[PDB]
């Protein structure tokens, strides 16, 4: 499962949460991902005894950010192959190192970080963002 | 700005396609949308 | 008078700049830093 090892072909490190992006198991059918989605590539290193090969259990992804990524990818004619996270939720300076998705991007091999990200004065000095495409913020939750 | 006599455009500017195509903006400092305005109301019927 | 309706296409504001001038990086960083100190909210509650 080398994904056909064969200049527009880049990894895309994504994550699933909220109606932003959701990961579902493969459509049974005959063992193939259904339509109206893009084949993700889950990575499992659950072997806690031996250094087994990473789990290449493929799945399917759908949601907001993946749809916008598909639109963008069509818009500028570049190929892609999604790839999920291995450790950490998003990324944080844990004693002078990014442990998360932003660490994956800054450490090469990723070349994208589409997901549920927040623009901040904490990662602009290692990566550089694009124009925000949704109005985030901090708000409250009180029962009526 | 574009000719020779300006360097910062601090003003009610706004992001869009062409202007961002021809110059480089910064991160936004307000998230205002576009809306509509009408006039208020007054008291009502039942006459006599 | 009063404003009604919902919000269609929602861009943002922003301080413009030239193309490839030395300031842009630092001015964007300064705006981003000040946006996380209540400064924007402080001035909004002071004036608007």
Swiss-Prot record, chain A:
It is found in: Cell membrane; Postsynaptic cell membrane; Cell projection, Dendrite; Late endosome. It comes from the Eukaryota. Phosphorylated on tyrosine residues. Disulfide bonds join 33-60, 40-61. L-glutamate binds at residues 118, 123. Changing residue 60 to Y: In MRD6; decreased protein abundance; decreased localization to the cell membrane; changed glutamate-gated calcium ion channel activity characterized by increased glutamate and glycine potency and increased open probability. Coiled coil: none annotated. Changing residue 40 to R: In MRD6; decreased protein abundance; decreased localization to the cell membrane. Changing residue 17 to G: In MRD6; decreased protein abundance; decreased localization to the cell membrane; changed glutamate-gated calcium ion channel activity characterized by decreased glutamate potency. Glycans are attached at residues 48, 95. Primarily found in the fronto-parieto-temporal cortex and hippocampus pyramidal cells, lower expression in the basal ganglia. Belongs to the glutamate-gated ion channel (TC 1.A.10.1) family. NR2B/GRIN2B subfamily. It is linked to Intellectual developmental disorder, autosomal dominant 6, with or without seizures: A disorder characterized by significantly below average general intellectual functioning associated with impairments in adaptive behavior and manifested during the developmental period. MRD6 additional features may include seizures, hypotonia, abnormal movements, such as dystonia, and autistic features. Developmental and epileptic encephalopathy 27: A form of epileptic encephalopathy, a heterogeneous group of severe early-onset epilepsies characterized by refractory seizures, neurodevelopmental impairment, and poor prognosis. Development is normal prior to seizure onset, after which cognitive and motor delays become apparent. The extracellular N-terminal domain (NTD) endows NMDARs with a unique capacity for allosteric modulation, harboring several binding sites for small molecule ligands that act as subunit-specific allosteric modulators of ion channel activity. Heterotetramer. Forms heterotetrameric channels composed of two GluN1/zeta subunits (GRIN1), and two identical GluN2/epsilon subunits (GRIN2A, GRIN2B, GRIN2C or GRIN2D) or GluN3 subunits (GRIN3A or GRIN3B) (in vitro). Can also form heterotetrameric channels that contain at least two GluN1 subunits and at least two different GluN2 subunits (or a combination of one GluN2 and one GluN3 subunits) (in vitro). In vivo, the subunit composition may depend on the expression levels of the different subunits. Found in a complex with GRIN1 and GRIN3B. Found in a complex with GRIN1, GRIN3A and PPP2CB. This is Glutamate receptor ionotropic, NMDA 2B. It comes from Homo sapiens. The chain holds residues 388 to 540 of 1484 of the full protein.
UniProtKB/Swiss-Prot annotation, chain B:
It comes from the Eukaryota. Coiled coil: none annotated. A hydrophobic region that gives rise to the prediction of a transmembrane span does not cross the membrane, but is part of a discontinuously helical region that dips into the membrane and is probably part of the pore and of the selectivity filter. The extracellular N-terminal domain (NTD) is a site of allosteric regulation to modulate overall receptor function. It is linked to Neurodevelopmental disorder with or without hyperkinetic movements and seizures, autosomal dominant: An autosomal dominant neurodevelopmental disorder characterized by severe intellectual disability and developmental delay, absent speech, muscular hypotonia, dyskinesia, and hyperkinetic movements. Cortical blindness, cerebral atrophy, and seizures are present in some patients. Heterotetramer; the NMDAR subunits are modular and harbor tiered domains that function in concert to regulate opening and closing of the cation-selective ion channel pore. Forms heterotetrameric channels composed of two GluN1/zeta subunits (GRIN1), and two identical GluN2/epsilon subunits (GRIN2A, GRIN2B, GRIN2C or GRIN2D) or GluN3 subunits (GRIN3A or GRIN3B) (in vitro). Can also form heterotetrameric channels that contain at least two GluN1 subunits and at least two different GluN2 subunits (or a combination of one GluN2 and one GluN3 subunits) (in vitro). It is found in: Cell membrane; Postsynaptic cell membrane; Postsynaptic density membrane; Synaptic cell membrane. Changing residue 48 to E: In NDHMSD; changed localization to the cell membrane; decreased glutamate-gated calcium ion channel activity. The gene is GRIN1. Component of N-methyl-D-aspartate (NMDA) receptors (NMDARs) that function as heterotetrameric, ligand-gated cation channels with high calcium permeability and voltage-dependent block by Mg(2+). NMDARs participate in synaptic plasticity for learning and memory formation by contributing to the long-term potentiation (LTP). Channel activation requires binding of the neurotransmitter L-glutamate to the GluN2 subunit, glycine or D-serine binding to the GluN1 subunit, plus membrane depolarization to eliminate channel inhibition by Mg(2+). The lineage of its organism: Eukaryota, Metazoa, Chordata, Craniata, Vertebrata. This is Glutamate receptor ionotropic, NMDA 1. It comes from Homo sapiens. Glycine binds at residues 12, 14, 19. Belongs to the glutamate-gated ion channel (TC 1.A.10.1) family. NR1/GRIN1 subfamily. NMDA is probably regulated by C-terminal phosphorylation of an isoform of GRIN1 by PKC. Its phosphorylated state is influenced by the formation of the NMDAR-PPP2CB complex and the NMDAR channel activity.
């Amino acid at each position: 499962y080398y994904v056909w090892p064969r200049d527009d072909h880049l990894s895309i490190v994504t994550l699933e949460e909220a109606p932003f992006v959701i990961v579902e198991s493969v459509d049974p059918l005959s063992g193939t991902c259904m339509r109206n989605t893009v084949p993700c590539e889950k990575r499992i290193v659950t072997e806690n005894k031996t250094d087994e090969e990473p789990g290449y259990i493929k799945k399917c992804c759908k949601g907001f950010c993946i749809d916008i990524l598909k639109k963008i990818s069509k818009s500028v004619k570049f190929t892609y192959d999604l790839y999920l996270v291995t450790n950490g939720k998003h990324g944080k300076k844990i004693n002078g190192t990014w442990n998360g998705m932003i660490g994956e991007v800054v450490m090469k091999r990723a070349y994208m970080a589409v997901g549920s990200l927040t623009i901040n004065e904490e990662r602009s000095e290692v990566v550089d963002f694009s124009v925000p495409f949704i109005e985030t913020g901090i708000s409250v939750m009180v029962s009526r | 700005l574009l000719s020779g006599q300006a360097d910062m455009i601090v003003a009610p500017l706004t992001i869009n396609n062409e202007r961002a195509q021809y110059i480089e903006f910064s991160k936004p400092f307000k998230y205002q949308g576009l809306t509509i305005l009408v006039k208020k109301e007054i008291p009502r019927s039942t006459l006599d | 008078l009063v404003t009604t309706g919902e919000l269609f296409f929602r861009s943002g504001f922003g301080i413009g700049m030239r193309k490839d001038s030395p300031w842009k990086q630092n001015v964007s960083l300064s705006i981003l830093k000040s946006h996380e100190n209540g400064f924007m909210e402080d001035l909004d509650k002071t004036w608007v």
